[PDB]
C-alpha cells in the first residue's frame, strides 16, 4: 500500500559576525530525521501517518535568506553532500573552505541569495562502518516507522564565509517519502 507524499519543516540558522579580517569560513552539519517531520499520533495508532514502513526518496534543503539585498561584505561558500555521518568538524572561523573541492560542491552566494540542494539521503545503519547503498529506486531499503526512535538520515554539510554583519537564514527542509502497509487500527468507542 504505497503512498508517496511530502513533509516539510522550517528552522533557523545564523552565522554570527566576526572581527577577523581574513576570509574565514564557518562549518556546520545537517542531519535529517523523520521525528522532526512526522509527529506522534494518538491512541492505538502511534504515529499520525498510519503506515508501517518508510523510505526517504529525496530531500530538498532550501536556504531562504533573511538579509536585505543591500547588505555588503558579501562572500562565497560551498554545500556538499555527505552520506556517512563523518562531517568536517564544526568550526567558527576556519582559514579555508573544506567543501570546495568536493565533487558534490555547489557554490553558496551570500548573504541575500537563495540556495537549494536536492538529493537522496542515506540512513545511518552502522556508524562504525558507515556503509550505504547507491541510488536505486527499486532496491532501496524499507525502514520501519518507529514510535520515538527513528534513525537519522544524513547528507548535507555547509561552509559559510563569515562577515562583519550577521547572516541569518530560514532553512526549509522538505522530505519526499514513500510509505507502505497502511495499518490503521479502529477500536470501538
Ligand X SMILES: O=C(O)[C@@H]1O[C@@H](O[C@H]2[C@H](O)[C@@H](NS(=O)(=O)O)[C@@H](O)O[C@@H]2COS(=O)(=O)O)[C@H](OS(=O)(=O)O)[C@@H](O)[C@@H]1O[C@H]1O[C@H](COS(=O)(=O)O)[C@@H](O)[C@H](O)[C@H]1NS(=O)(=O)O
Name the residues that contact ligand X, by CB under 6 A: 35, 40, 43, 46, 147-148
Minimum CB distance to ligand X, residue 38 (Å): 9
Rounded to 5 degrees, what angle do the CA atoms 50, 85, 39 make?
A: 20
Does 19 contact a copy of itself by CB under 8 A?
no
CB of 88 to ligand X, least distance (A): 17
Please tell me the distance from the alpha carbon of residue 189 to that of residue 187, in angstroms, as a whole number.
Answer: 7
- The conformation of residue 18, written as its DSSP 8-state character, comes to -
Provide the terminal-to-terminal Cα distance of the chain, rounded to the nearest Å: 27
Question: Binding residue for a copy of itself (CB under 8 A) from 16, 20, 116, 142?
Answer: 142
Question: Which does residue 89 bind out of ligand X, a copy of itself, none, counting CB within 5 to 8 angstroms by kind?
Answer: none
User: What residues numbered 22-81 form the site for a copy of itself, per CB under 8 A?
Assistant: 22-23, 35-45, 48-50, 52-53, 64-76
Closer to ligand X by Cβ: residue 43 or 68: 43
**What's the rounded Cα separation, in Å, for the pair 32 and 13?**
15
Any contact of residue 118 with a copy of itself (CB under 8 A)? no
Name which of 174, 180, 141, 181 is nearest 34 in CA terms: 174
Amino acid at each position: 500500500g504505497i503512498f508517496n507524499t511530502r513533509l516539510s519543516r522550517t528552522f533557523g540558522y545564523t552565522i554570527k559576525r566576526t572581527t577577523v579580517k581574513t576570509p574565514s569560513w564557518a562549518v556546520d552539519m545537517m542531519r535529517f530525521n523523520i521525528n522532526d517531520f512526522l509527529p506522534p499520533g494518538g491512541g492505538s495508532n502511534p504515529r499520525s501517518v498510519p503506515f508501517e514502513y518508510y523510505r526517504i526518496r529525496k530531500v530538498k534543503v532550501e536556504f531562504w535568506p533573511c538579509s536585505p539585498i543591500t547588505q555588503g561584505d558579501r562572500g562565497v561558500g560551498s554545500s556538499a553532500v555527505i552520506l556517512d555521518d563523518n562531517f568536517v568538524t564544526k568550526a567558527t572561523a576556519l582559514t579555508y573552505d573544506p567543501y570546495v573541492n568536493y565533487s558534490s560542491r555547489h557554490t553558496i552566494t551570500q548573504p541575500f541569495s537563495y540556495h537549494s540542494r536536492y538529493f537522496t539521503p542515506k540512513p545511518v545503519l552502522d556508524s562504525t562502518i558507515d556503509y550505504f547503498q547507491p541510488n536505486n529506486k527499486r532496491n532501496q531499503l524499507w525502514l520501519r516507522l518507529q514510535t520515538a526512535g527513528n534513525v537519522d538520515h544524513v547528507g548535507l554539510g555547509t561552509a559559510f564565509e563569515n562577515s562583519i554583519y550577521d547572516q541569518e537564514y530560514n532553512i526549509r527542509v522538505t522530505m519526499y517519502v514513500q510509505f507502505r502497509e497502511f495499518n490503521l487500527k479502529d477500536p470501538p468507542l
